[PDB]
Design a binder for this molecule. Structure first.
Ligand SMILES: [Cl-]
Length: 161
């Protein structure tokens, strides 16, 4: 037992962890990017998966848990309301990870990309991720796709040890 954070630049649908967090689209839809990859790999986990912005809902695919976390779309939310809902989504992820009793979890950065409102939200989203997941016992593996983001996430991980 020595919980860590790691970052990998690859498709989260190929993760090596005991459960996955989906950067879920609202309304339980297949979405794009990460959510679409999750839909292609674990389509059964989208049965009644819809959950409001700021929340998370776990649906099993077989016995593999998919934690659907709906971050805010900053094109629709103000900066202050969106920040609150982004923090809350990660808090509900940490609660689901705890309830599931998993030893590890694969997580993407919520409210980035098409939900970012055209702004770079790495630091904002990653810091809410740390605040929530620091409360758990699980190994956390953060998944990104951009090479400069991998570098920055790795630097943030390094300066917490
Ligand atoms: Cl990325």
């Amino acid at each position: 037992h020595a919980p860590s954070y790691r970052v990998k630049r690859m498709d989260i649908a190929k993760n090596d962890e005991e459960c996955v967090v989906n950067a879920a689209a609202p309304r339980g839809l297949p979405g794009n990017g990460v959510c679409k990859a999750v839909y292609k790999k674990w389509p059964e986990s989208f049965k009644n998966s819809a959950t409001p912005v700021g929340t998370a809902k776990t649906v099993m695919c077989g016995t593999y848990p998919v934690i659907h976390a709906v971050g805010p779309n900053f094109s629709n939310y103000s900066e202050s309301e969106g920040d609150r809902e982004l923090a809350a989504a990660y808090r509900e992820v940490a609660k689901e990870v705890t309830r599931l009793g998993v030893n590890s979890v694969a997580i993407p950065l919520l409210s980035t990309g098409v939900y970012s409102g055209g702004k770079d939200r790495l630091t904002q989203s990653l810091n809410h991720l740390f605040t929530a997941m620091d409360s758990t016992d699980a190994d956390v593996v953060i998944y990104c796709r951009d090479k400069e983001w991998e570098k920055k996430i790795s630097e943030a991980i390094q300066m917490r040890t």
